[PDB]
Design an enzyme around this catalytic site. Structure first.
Site, PDB file in Angstrom:
ATOM      1  N   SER A   1       0.876  -1.165   0.000  1.00 16.64           N
ATOM      2  CA  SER A   1       0.000   0.000   0.000  1.00 16.64           C
ATOM      3  C   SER A   1       0.912   1.213   0.000  1.00 16.64           C
ATOM      4  CB  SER A   1      -0.924  -0.001   1.238  1.00 16.64           C
ATOM      5  OG  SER A   1      -1.589   1.259   1.412  1.00 16.64           O
TER       6      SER A   1
ATOM      7  N   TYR B   1      -2.828  -1.709  10.202  1.00 17.90           N
ATOM      8  CA  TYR B   1      -2.635  -1.801   8.751  1.00 17.90           C
ATOM      9  C   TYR B   1      -1.310  -1.215   8.297  1.00 17.90           C
ATOM     10  CZ  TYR B   1      -4.036  -1.281   3.737  1.00 17.90           C
ATOM     11  OH  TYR B   1      -4.118  -1.324   2.361  1.00 17.90           O
TER      12      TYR B   1
END
Lengths: 260, 256, 256, 256
Positions: free
Chosen positions: B143, B156
């Site tokens: 990401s 995350y």
């Protein structure tokens, strides 16, 4: 750099980098809780600090366990009145190539390095966020937070992860006057290193000097081991910094191994 | 090249979203593709789609947090197709909370799925890739949050950062066995969830350009196509020249 | 595919630049090969045209504003557009900083960086028109990201290119102009073929693997093809998703 | 640490701003400080300010783009004080324009002052620091724009990126001579220029927190003291542990 009236918790601090950090913070005026799995080990450091005229206590804590961490951090807060500084420190290293890396070892590595950082942080924020009193949270990373070596997938993964957590804490903690930093030590010479050197020399078929200068410190600029003092001084600098200007940053203390 | 005729790929978390598009694109490029997902029906559906469209695919039930399940599932891929040439480790679970309210159970679940799933699937894939130094390509789906943080996403961001470290170690260990590693780091993708979040959150067009995509240079969402084409490019690359690198597919959100 | 697209590649009479030109032409682009040496440029253009592509050679001192503007305008007039600019230089002058001649320093910065600035400036005149858009690619190095001793001018210039590219990604977006930097590792040139056996005395396998490629994962030289394929991929990418990013093509020497 | 009694420092660009504050702090710490600047009167004024507060300083006229002027000026430091232990290369000149309207004259001035000035003063300082491997500290004043771009600042961002490369090369070359190198990267500093832009640019409060400091975590301006304290800490550090590193002093604007 003066920490008079400040309160600090250092984990994994019965020895090595964590112990030297504790010693340095206390020397600077901080009241320091030395947290470690081993209460006697923690106490020895606390006793050294008290003898030298500082103020410390030893706190037993399994940093992978939420209950033990919450209780222990609260005990510190009760003894000292606050938790101004948290240094999350672990050095456990288990090597193996990935295809042979045990899932049990993998999980223990993540739990100690990263869950320990998450839990102690969460516990410290309960106190730091109170009336936005504020705080400094420092994770002990590694040059392996930034660069990989073979056989160290668990450690490199964990130390990389610590950067992410610290960067999120810098954005979340700002409104509560909480700063975050990561300190990233290079190669420190240990009794273990002293034994690993002749081993690798025999196995690789080169001199021990070549093992030191080329294999271990080949990516430094000067062929010099990083000292626990190097590391502790940098932690002190951060702990006492007069504003949040350095929040979210990592500091590579490695004699030029990985330059950012 | 990018042609993957005679190649074999497994994509985890691939019943929908980014993982599914990657699976479709690899199959379109000639690869035999195993769709791994926690939900067997979801995995089969993608495999059916690929097969009906003239490709070659199987569905595989897999809890990527479970070693036995990963080992068995990856072994099924090799059993069916003869080899495992490509692993795309993909997971999208997102649980948000400020750190002081972040549940330890949620924390451990996030790390298990994103990171342990990457470790377990990699370990299992290497058993096949390392045999006779046959080689392979392992791609982790990271990401922009592999590189940069956002508040409320400690779990995350920590996991996505950790994926870089695992990939970089794999790059070093795998070279002698002809295994390459990469991380693909998508920016803000307009998922069905985001679709719901846009009218609820200034008008919608302000919500999109300023609130959500303010860190892009152009106010454009990253597409599943942008991501899949990058994965395809890496999968078919003719040398290990790109091993260890991460590829940020974000319209200028975090430039390195 | 780059049909109906036009590309300028500077420093392209040889090496990486030349392979980039050949590859873009193969992909259907009309290519102008720009070089100080018009004969060298012509040779590449002749090789393209003989293979059924479309190319011209253009003499250009990329450190000179007048020569660059005139040269780029000439390309645009002949081909009708400038869709792709690859700014490429490889001059290397080594010396320790204390003995580094200020004349050498300025020439290094002028060719590597001023050249990129001037050719960019001239190309944007055409790319910004009617917001036609374009892709600007700078050829950097692993030395855009990491230093070596004796190479202060080169490292400084190659680090600087990242900064310029990253600004252009932000400014260019509203005009559909993307920027990228491609960062090759160690490429085996005829010069390197000469240095290997002499440094072996001043094992060959040891010079290659330890001295020159010790920071790679596999001890393999980057190829001009490695580089060219990456430039092609960026040139033909179907959105601005990769704008502002650099791409390290080095076999694991510096991983980002 | 951080005491510099018996140390000698030269700070360029130091008649005002960050440079002046650095000069003041080094002298407060006990260093003998030479204030170098294009304007001799400005340099003298800081030198007089230091001397009256109990410190030890001299003013030096120096055009940092000029090799002779730099060599002479740095020699004057060694002559007056006996040595040159610390060099802080500092410049803040900013010229904004979009790339397509960026004057080549402005471009070359920007690079000559920011980068050539760092190169020239470094080279002059090493003649003294390398003498008997006496050693020293060289600190370049960068920016968050050494790491991240903004529109309209191609020349500045390029220069500041390039400074990283030079420092990293110096870190490697200088080590055997006991010379360390660092880069300090300030974020958004509230200057009198900024002071005038805030009311010009709806609420003043809004302009500060959103428009200018939107990429900080706290909406706080970086202070000249933040910067000077960091320079001091580096200047006094008891080993080369931190050589080659950059230090981002920006309240969370670009985290690494």
């Amino acid at each position: 750099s003066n920490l008079n009236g400040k309160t600090a918790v250092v984990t994994g601090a019965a020895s090595g980098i964590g112990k030297e950090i504790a010693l340095e913070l206390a020397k600077a005026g901080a009241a320091v809780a030395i947290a470690d799995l081993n209460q006697d080990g923690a106490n020895a450091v606390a006793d050294e600090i008290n003898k030298a005229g500082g103020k410390a206590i030893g706190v037993a804590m399994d940093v992978t366990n939420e209950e033990a961490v919450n209780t222990g951090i609260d005990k510190v807060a009760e003894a000292f009145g606050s938790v101004d500084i948290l240094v999350s420190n672990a050095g456990i290293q288990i090597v193996n190539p990935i295809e042979n890396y045990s899932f049990a070892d993998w999980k223990k590595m993540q739990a100690i390095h990263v869950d320990g950082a998450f839990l102690t942080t969460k516990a410290a924020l309960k106190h730091m966020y109170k009336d936005d009193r504020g705080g400094v949270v420092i994770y002990m990373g590694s040059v392996h937070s930034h660069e990989a070596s073979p056989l160290k997938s668990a450690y490199v993964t964990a130390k990389h992860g610590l950067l992410g957590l610290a960067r999120v804490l810098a954005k979340e903690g700002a409104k509560h006057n909480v700063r975050s930093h990561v300190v990233c030590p290079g190669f420190v010479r240990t009794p273990l290193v002293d034994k690993q050197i002749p081993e690798q020399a025999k196995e690789l078929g080169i001199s021990e000097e070549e093992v030191i200068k080329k294999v271990m410190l080949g990516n430094t600029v000067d062929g010099v081991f990083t000292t626990v003092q190097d590391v502790a001084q940098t932690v002190l600098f951060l702990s006492a910094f007069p504003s949040a200007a350095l929040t979210g940053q990592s500091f590579i203390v490695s004699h030029g191994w990985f330059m950012q």
